[PDB]
Amino acid sequence: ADLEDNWECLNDNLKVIEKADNAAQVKDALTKMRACALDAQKATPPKLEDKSPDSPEMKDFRHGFDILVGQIDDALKLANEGKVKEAQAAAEQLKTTRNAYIQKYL
């Protein structure tokens, strides 16, 4: 229920998407990613407990999640049109956002 759990939820569902055979499986996993991303967005990461809630780093942290959620939405749109492989490729790129925006605060 904490950050770390929500982060590993992103990792597990990225694996679900990588291994998926159909669009419905990709949609389910992207749904879980989005829910976990929203919960993570509300946490205070271990690099920033001393900082003010409105600090530039905390801004960075939460905006990494707004960016991530928007990209999850873009992948969901692909999956909702049945474009499985396109949705899987979009999900791979979610890793680049996750790594560049959020990892440095964990």
From Swiss-Prot:
It is found in: Periplasm. Heme b binds at residues 7, 102. Its main location: periplasm. Binds 1 heme b (iron(II)-protoporphyrin IX) group per molecule. Residues 47-60 have a biased composition (Basic and acidic residues). One of its GO terms (biological process) is electron transport chain. One of its GO terms (molecular function) is electron transfer activity. Residues 38-60 are annotated as: Disordered. Its cofactor is heme b. GO terms for cellular component: periplasmic space. Keywords: Electron transport, Heme, Iron, Metal-binding, Periplasm, Signal, Transport. The keyword Signal applies. Electron-transport protein of unknown function. Belongs to the cytochrome b562 family. Monomer. This is Soluble cytochrome b562. The gene is cybC.
